[model samples]
Target: MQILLANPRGFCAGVDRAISIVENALAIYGAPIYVRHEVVHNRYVVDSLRERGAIFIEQISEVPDGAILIFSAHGVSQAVRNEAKSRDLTVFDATCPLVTKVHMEVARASRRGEESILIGHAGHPEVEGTMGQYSNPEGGMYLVESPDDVWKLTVKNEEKLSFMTQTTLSVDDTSDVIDALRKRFPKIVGPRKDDICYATTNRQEAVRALAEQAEVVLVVGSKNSSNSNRLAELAQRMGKRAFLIDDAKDIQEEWVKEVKCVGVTAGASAPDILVQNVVARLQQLGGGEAIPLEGREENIVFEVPKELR
Candidate 1:
């Protein structure tokens, strides 16, 4: 058996930036600083931060008034921001700069009287945060998960339509939905540039290469991770058997049976240590020659807020 590793796997710029923010906060502000949610959607990453004195909560109200609060990398609704400010909490935004760019896109569309058609899985934090930018009274944005959904969508004005996407999404699937949207609403606009993060796109491209040669592919990411799930889904879509697992412990010997070559990749939020563990496990199971297919070499970096510096 052999293994093919995807280049550009594991921590991307946004995730790296987010984890750094929490570490910096712990160093300067001391333990027990509050984070609005799991800082980056990885259980291991969250647990490590929790031990370092970061408190994770789902609601702003859960935080003590006037204490420090950091937003997650998925970004947050304007309501979350306003609520945090209203309570006088000192805030440092850990929102991924890429996700923040999506928010700005929605804000720009709304300012022009345009209704947004967001392409994303419902209930994902990034999706929620992006859609929540519009008010319910103004008949907040329409959410579509597929090309079929595009056919059923209706907007108040056909001309006043623009589309944005969650930063983490399957590039191929998102393209299909966008194609369907364009076919249905020719006048509908989209972001000034693609909202699919470079990390997501690059990882997917690497996975496509992996799937072509691998008999089975394993994606290392938490279930709730949008980008992580997409990598597994994409491999399956390309006809290779794929499974999304949180770590090496999730790898079943049964899945490895009869597979000559296995491919491994990690989500943006997932740590590389998990990938290393998975490789070690594969080696123990008789896998050999861990070849990493060449893919995009990313040099992008987002700086921590100056307050943290």
Candidate 2:
């Protein structure tokens, strides 16, 4: 079988910055440095950090007094920040600048007494955090996952409405939802561009191109990763059989057996080493040497906190 590797796949600038923050903190602070969540959503990345004394916790309460805490790349709500301050923890916010941009939109809209419609999946940490940015007790913020949700939504003030999206969402799906919102609320306002980050847009675009040429596509990413899941789903939407596997070990021979071509890509938070391992495994299964497809060259690099540097 022929193997094609999508260009610009794997680690993005934000994920790179987030992971580096944790590693830098660990290097400087010694073991037991606390992270508020999986620094990024990759199993291998989290496990590697855990091995080197990064402690991942879901709540600020879990962190010890006077400990150093790093926020995840997904960002955090104002409530979480307040709680972290209450606990006297020294915080190094690892939130991606792109996610932070969304949070700012929510905060700005809230200050202007405008309600918001957030396009994202429920319970995703980024959604939760962005939702929390709406501190207006009297105003409203609604989370809508699809165009259907947009049709069903009831807001306190439709005239004073703004829409924002999770940074890691399918570009085409979000546009449909945005169009639905605009048709229903013509006066609604939003960012000049969709909130989906550049890496996500580029990766999805690359995968779409890859899927068109391959018989089966394998997405290397953890299930809990929103952007990772989106990559696999995007491939499937293009009519190719797609599987979201966390690593090379998760690949099933049945999925690729006798397939004439296979496409492989990784999510924003996934490591390139895992992709190499997947390519190696595919070769062992009789696939030809991996060929890199021509795609975007990502030059963006987010700097870590100055304290970490």
Candidate 3:
């Protein structure tokens, strides 16, 4: 069997920066560094860091006082930052600048006395962090996962509202939700550019571009990875059977059987090594050569903080 390897498929700039922060912290500060969340939703990446002495906890309270603490790339709520400060944890924020941009949007709207709505999956670290930014019981931030959720939204001031979104989301699904928001509240405002990051959009677009000849698409990413799952889900929406897996060992004979071609892509936090390993497994699974598909040229880079640099 043969497959098309999609481009712009793994390790976007933010993920790169976030991982580098951990490595730098390990080198500079030494072991036992505490991180607030999975730095980028990939267990392989997390485990590797853990082996190097990064301890991931769900809360700042898990960290000891005055210890080095780094926020995940998903960003954190203002509350987490405040707690870290109060605890005097040596802090390094690995929050993706794109996510931080959305935070600034919420902060700006909050300062303007406007209620904000967030379009994101509930419980996702990114969503949780973004929601925690301007959440209020009254005209605070409301979370909507779908177009259906958008219609149910009841913000205190529809006239004084704007929307921010999770950076890594299905582009098509997000547009539907945004359209629903605009229909319900004609005066609703959003960022000058949409909040979804360029990497997410380009990666999904790459999958669609590569799907033209693929009967099945294998997405290399952890189950908890939102962006990786989006690629698999988007492929299904594009009429291709998509399998989301963490690595090569997850592929099955049936996945490639009866199909002339398959497509392989990965999530932003996923590494290209997983893609190569999957292709290697294809040979044993009755597959031929894996062809790399030309799809995107991504040059974007998010820098680690100067202190780390």
lDDT of each: 0.89, 0.93, 0.87
Better of 1 and 3 by TM-score: 3
The C-alpha TM-scores of every prediction are 0.96, 0.98, 0.96
> Which stretches of candidate 1 lie above 4 Å from their native place?
136-140
Candidate 1 — what's its lDDT?
A: 0.89
Candidate 1: residue 285 Cα off by (Å): 0.7
Angstrom error at residue 243, model 3: 0.7
Ranked candidates, highest TM-score first:
2, 3, 1
Tens-digit lDDT string for candidate 1 (224-264):
89899889999999898899988899999999987899999
lDDT of 2 by residue, 270-298 (tens): 89999999999999998998999999888
Which regions of candidate 3 deviate over 4 angstroms? 135-138
For candidate 2, which ten residues in a row score worst on lDDT?
A: 185-194
Candidate 2 lands at a TM-score of: 0.98
Clashing pairs in 2: none
- Indicate the worst ten consecutive residues by lDDT in candidate 3: 132-141
